[PDB]
Design a protein around this nucleic acid. Structure first.
Lengths: 50, 177, 75, 116, 136, 55
RNA sequence: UGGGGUAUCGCCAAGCGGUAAGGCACCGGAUUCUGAUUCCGGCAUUCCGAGGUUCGAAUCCUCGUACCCCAGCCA
RNA sequence: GCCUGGCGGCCGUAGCGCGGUGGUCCCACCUGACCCCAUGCCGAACUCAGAAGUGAAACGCCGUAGCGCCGAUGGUAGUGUGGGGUCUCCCCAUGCGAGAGUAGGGAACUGCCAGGCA
RNA sequence: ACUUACCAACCCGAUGCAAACUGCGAAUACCGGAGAAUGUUAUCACGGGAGACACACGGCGGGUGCUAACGUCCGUC
RNA sequence: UCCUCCUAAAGAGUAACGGAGGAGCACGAAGGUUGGCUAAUCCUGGUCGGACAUCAGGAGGUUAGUGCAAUGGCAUAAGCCAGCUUGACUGCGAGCGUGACGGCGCGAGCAGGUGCGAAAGCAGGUCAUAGUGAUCCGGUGGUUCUGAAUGGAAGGGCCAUC
RNA sequence: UAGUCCGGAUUGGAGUCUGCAACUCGACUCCAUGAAGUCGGAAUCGCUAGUAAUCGUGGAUCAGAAUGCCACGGUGAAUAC
């Protein structure tokens, strides 16, 4: 519905991204989640609420 | 602690004499005194409930707990979890100090004071009364009032019957018209 | 105004009492916890009860609420 | 009811430890005693028990029912449990907060060798 | 006419009418009009029979209608094909089995109870009989 | 009680016109002048003049 | 019979779920010899009836009523 | 042996209600709170330091069936197979056989450990 | 504040009804294990070739219909 | 098209223009964990305060609640509140369920790295069951795997994804 | 510069006088109360000089009852193309 799709990109040098959905209207703030990076193999901070 | 000591000698002794109790612990004691100020006009204004909270903070010696709505009802234009009153649960030493100020200097400063009603027991001894002004407490500055805000006191005690609460409260002389 | 129903989900008891199971085998695919998990039985995310060890299926009635457990006897 | 509220606080970890099948060290705090007993994985039979109502523990204490008494009990249960071949238990705090003298009892049981 | 004030679903399946009845003794009153045939009874037949009784034993006595309709019967209109939904709720019946005390009466002599129950059993579709209040 | 979220509740001394010097804890933070106390308030004389009307 | 629409002050007609807006009329004052015109003030419908959802219904849903419009065909 | 505490088996013949009793120990209420910790206010709860006082409440135990609960025997309902009729419903042979109700039972029984008394 | 042929919540006692009610609950069927006799492996897997996918009535359990139909739609034989 | 109940004959499945309702999402907390707590409604007393807003006590028992239908669940709570958080992880997966197939579902455990907890442990989204769309064609990021003489590149592949 | 030391209505209490008699239904006094009203919509009226405006005083009727009526004087305008 209204809830958009975003890419959580990795803070390490890799291009690896998780992908998910955000309500852009009610939460306009960016979304930072310490997720797992399998190219670095380490839990790195992910950014970019699209 | 003045009326707590007065309790521990003369009210315990007096009620052991009146009622023919066996245990010294079967005697009624006042558990707590809750001061509610259910403001309700804070559906539109927040500073009004903040001033109410400052007034219960002054009348007792504690921060009040701002209470929220349990159900939503449309009769009064409220909603679930909307903050609508504030209360202070006084117990322990501050219960006796507030009870001393209450029956000593706050109750006589009531306008047109005829007496407190004796039929204001809920069947289990627990008294509850209502003051119409916050001015009757000597702490509230008369020059700093904005809205007249009464409140309701509730003495909760460990008596089983309400005549037993007549006896307990009346042993502090607690006016009773 | 009517004329619709969902597809039948094929719930129920898949392995009955005394029936020998392997580990991992689903015993009761069900909807709440009509049957609860007992010894050597796990409860999945959709309340599917599955054999966590090998053995034999044991339907029992335990506890103060008369719940219907499903154990597995080691066999 | 205070006792019933405590038992329903206990129940989740109790049933979880009966589900895993681990020997549990059940504690029990009273306003003047602490009790500690090691119970088999079937839940019925005890193995080791020490407490402040035993005069072997109570005579060497100032007051049964404070943190020194509870540390004495934890040391006692760890000693007796190591004497009976029990090494690795799981701590059942039995509805109390792991804070005061149940923490003193369990820390004292961990210093004296009991593995949890 | 009798009809439940407020149902839970408007249309009921047919189902069958087997076995014997539950209301069997004359419970409230002293004389009873008990079913023998199976059948089912619309609300109009219950009302017709009750007016025959109430007229017959005049405004003395006391009459209990022990059955109640509560089962909606649907019919399709005329020149409507088969299919295209279930019909519409036309009336309401009670399902009767052999043994139902359909009516009770008290406060009259037995001979007026015979008379009113004859007068009213001729408004019902089932074979019917007269019973009395037996003591255990 | 918690820390400083509560108002300062210091013992003061109240005194009314009845000669009743009475020290109490109250969070006014100031000594107090009153008129009516529990001792010497017109409560019983008030009830008497209330009942004493008719004739 | 089905589908759609309407029901809001005495009349015609606006209303967005948290308040009922307009015109004509009516009421009071004034102008006038008097009436019409005019001018100054007012009032005013708890919204067709019943039930339900909602904290809250004119507003949303369902049913009934009353009046309109369209269809009710091929054989 | 009696009593109390803990952890279980069992899950109402075990629970409710009415009445009586217990505190040497145990337990509970209690005493105090500056500290460990805590309250969207409050040592009420949680927690800590204790032990003056009472078993009032609580809890345990003992009575009491007012109720809940268990519950036959018999009959009834239903029904598998075969057969029959007046066949939208029933009957026969045969196998299984309730629910409700009745007589009655009934205020539990028990294991491990620990402490107090004899 | 004073009277009352009227209605009536909740509670209690008694009486029925329910596909979308259940503090009870069969027969049967189904799944699993063991055992005997019988059966031309009747069973399963893999491979070659299909055909068929308009069904009908009759018993039993039902929906729809009017417990109407040589009606219609299922289950089972 | 998908979800729930009944029909549906006490395993599963089962039809009709049969009877009734819902979905085409929401949520970075409404997820994870740890610690705690327990409803509806009615009665009584009480300032404004009222049938119904807050307070206190009692009866009551989950008649409540569950982000949204219905059914089955739920007190050890799956309900309600707070602290810290990102397991709403990555690669796999014994074994099963379910479909003609395409597919869909449940999953203990193994490895790497993480959160909560003192610890046992729990966490691969949400009480569960709806919230959806094959292939082709093409877009974006990563990876020399390929790269029509050769070195690159273009294009293609593979992984992620629209 | 305030609904105020404006305004006095209204109302409670206490009285005096006249009069057979102040309840319906007088006048005045004292204490208390202290509304509305902050210059008046459409419209409308009077006045040309001792005038309008404003300030008091007297009388007739009358036992007592005028903010009316009829008189009397004090101060004293503006404006008329």
């Amino acid at each position: 519905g209204i809830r958009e799709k975003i890419k959580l990109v990795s803070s390490a040098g890799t291009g690896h991204f998780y992908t998910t959905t955000k309500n852009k209207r009610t939460k306009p703030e960016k979304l930072e989640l310490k997720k797992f990076d399998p190219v670095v193999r380490q839990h790195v901070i992910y950014k970019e609420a699209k | 602690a003045k009326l707590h000591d007065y309790y521990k000698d003369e009210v315990v002794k007096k009620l052991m004499t009146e009622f023919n109790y066996n245990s010294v612990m079967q005697v009624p004691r006042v558990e707590k005194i809750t001061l509610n100020m259910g403001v309700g006009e804070a559906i539109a204004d927040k500073k009004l409930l903040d001033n109410a909270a400052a007034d219960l903070a002054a009348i007792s010696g504690q921060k009040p707990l701002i209470t929220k709505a349990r159900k939503s009802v449309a009769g009064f234009k409220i909603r679930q979890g909307y903050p609508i009153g504030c209360k202070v649960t006084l117990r322990g030493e501050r219960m006796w100090e507030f009870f001393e100020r209450l029956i000593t200097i706050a109750v006589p400063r009531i306008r047109d004071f005829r007496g407190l009603s004796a039929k204001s027991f809920d069947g289990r001894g627990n008294y509850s009364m209502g003051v119409r002004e916050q001015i009757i407490f000597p702490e509230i500055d008369y020059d700093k009032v904005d809205r007249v805000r009464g409140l309701d006191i509730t003495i909760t005690t460990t008596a089983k019957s309400d005549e037993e609460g007549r006896a307990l409260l009346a042993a502090f002389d607690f006016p009773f018209r | 105004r009517n004329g619709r129903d969902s597809e039948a989900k094929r719930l129920g008891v898949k392995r009955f009492g005394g029936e020998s199971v392997l580990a991992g085998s689903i015993i009761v695919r069900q909807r709440g916890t009509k049957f609860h998990a007992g010894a050597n039985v796990g409860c999945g995310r959709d309340h599917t009860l599955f054999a966590k060890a090998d053995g034999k299926v044991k339907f029992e009635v335990k506890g103060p609420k008369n719940r219907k457990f499903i154990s597995i006897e080691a066999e | 009811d205070k006792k019933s509220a405590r038992i329903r606080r206990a129940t989740r970890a109790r049933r979880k430890l009966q589900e895993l099948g681990a020997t549990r060290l059940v504690v029990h705090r009273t306003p003047r005693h602490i009790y500690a007993q090691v119970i088999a994985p079937n839940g019925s039979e005890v193995l080791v028990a020490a407490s402040t109502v035993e005069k072997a523990i109570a005579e060497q204490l100032k007051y049964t029912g404070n943190k020194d008494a509870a540390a004495a009990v934890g040391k006692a249960v760890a000693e007796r449990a190591l004497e009976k071949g029990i090494k690795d238990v799981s701590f059942d705090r039995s509805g109390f907060q792991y804070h005061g003298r149940v923490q003193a009892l369990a820390d004292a049981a961990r210093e004296a060798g009991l593995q949890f | 006419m009798l009809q439940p004030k407020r149902t839970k679903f408007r249309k009921m399946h047919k189902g069958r009418n087997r076995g014997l009845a539950q209301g069997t003794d004359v419970s409230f009153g002293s004389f009873g009009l008990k079913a023998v045939g199976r059948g089912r009874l619309t609300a109009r037949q219950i009302e017709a029979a009750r007016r025959a009784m109430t007229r017959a034993v005049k405004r003395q006595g006391k009459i209990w209608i022990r059955v109640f309709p509560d089962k909606p019967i649907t019919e399709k209109p005329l020149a409507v094909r088969m299919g295209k939904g279930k019909g519409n709720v036309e009336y309401w019946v009670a399902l009767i089995q052999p043994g139902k005390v359909l009516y009770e009466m008290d406060g009259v002599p037995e001979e007026l109870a015979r008379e009113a129950f004859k007068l009213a059993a001729a408004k019902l579709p089932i074979k019917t009989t007269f019973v009395t209040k037996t003591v255990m | 009680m918690k820390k400083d979220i509560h108002p300062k509740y210091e013992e003061i001394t109240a005194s009314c016109s009845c000669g009743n010097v009475m020290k109490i804890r109250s969070t006014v933070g100031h000594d107090l002048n009153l008129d009516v106390c529990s001792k010497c308030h017109p409560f019983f004389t008030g009830k008497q003049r209330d009942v004493a009307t008719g004739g």
